[PDB]
Amino acid sequence: APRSVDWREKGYVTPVKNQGQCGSCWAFSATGALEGQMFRKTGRLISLSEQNLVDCSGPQGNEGCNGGLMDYAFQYVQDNGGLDSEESYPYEATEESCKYNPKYSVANDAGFVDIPKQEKALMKAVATVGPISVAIDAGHESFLFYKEGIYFEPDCSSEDMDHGVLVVGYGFESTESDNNKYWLVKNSWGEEWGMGGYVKMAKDRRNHCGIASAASYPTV
Numbered sequence: 001a002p003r004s005v006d007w008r009e010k011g012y013v014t015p016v017k018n019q020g021q022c023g024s025c026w027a028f029s030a031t032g033a034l035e036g037q038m039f040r041k042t043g044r045l046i047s048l049s050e051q052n053l054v055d056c057s058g059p060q061g062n063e064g065c066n067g068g069l070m071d072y073a074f075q076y077v078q079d080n081g082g083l084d085s086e087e088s089y090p091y092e093a094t095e096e097s098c099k100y101n102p103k104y105s106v107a108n109d110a111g112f113v114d115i116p117k118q119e120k121a122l123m124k125a126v127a128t129v130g131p132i133s134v135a136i137d138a139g140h141e142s143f144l145f146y147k148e149g150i151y152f153e154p155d156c157s158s159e160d161m162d163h164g165v166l167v168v169g170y171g172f173e174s175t176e177s178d179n180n181k182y183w184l185v186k187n188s189w190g191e192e193w194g195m196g197g198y199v200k201m202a203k204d205r206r207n208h209c210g211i212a213s214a215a216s217y218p219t220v
């Protein structure tokens, strides 16, 4: 596979969003992966509605601001036959009743693909598919204050993930410890967090923070 990948340079990635004070990271991760796959198909990048997922995908197993899973979001889009655009169904950071309107649907999927729980398989998916939805252990102060460089947290769990984000690429840079590889990860905490809202997470360091443990993408 390539040494470096960045799907932002290919037009697959919308700007960084802000989930606010709602536990809806899973919906931002899901819309990010579907934005990328929709773009691959149609050549048009259209920001999608996280609020649509938060309000409406309970029957697939999601729980709104109390948490969810990207795969359930992808299942909702398939079962529901659509997903509204961000502009038509904007984000309010609180769970409300469902207001989906098929007239404003701009995305569809036909299911999803779960990636084997190995960073080698995640790397192949990122290299060939597009941005990939992943779950990480983000429950550490070091993650809140991240600004620059490759993020590595010795106390990160590879098993107990609590935060959905979006791998948009991977790369390398020289470091003091010669652990030089990273995943390029889009977060949903606004652009003031991290590096314009992105983090470089340690790659090929024993599945650091569980990034390869629950990776998937929608089939469009």
Ligand SMILES: *[C@@H](O)[C@H](CCCC)NC(=O)[C@H](CC(C)C)NC(=O)OCc1ccccc1
Pocket (backbone or CB within 6 Å): 019, 022, 023, 024, 025, 026, 061, 062, 063, 065, 066, 067, 068, 069, 070, 134, 135, 136, 161, 162, 163, 164, 214
């Ligand atoms: C990130 O904004 C949220 C915060 C959840 C607590 C308020 N994290 C998640 O939703 C997290 C993401 C996965 C690890 C991909 N999942 C989660 O909290 O799941 C709990 C849950 C499981 C199944 C069904 C409903 C809720």
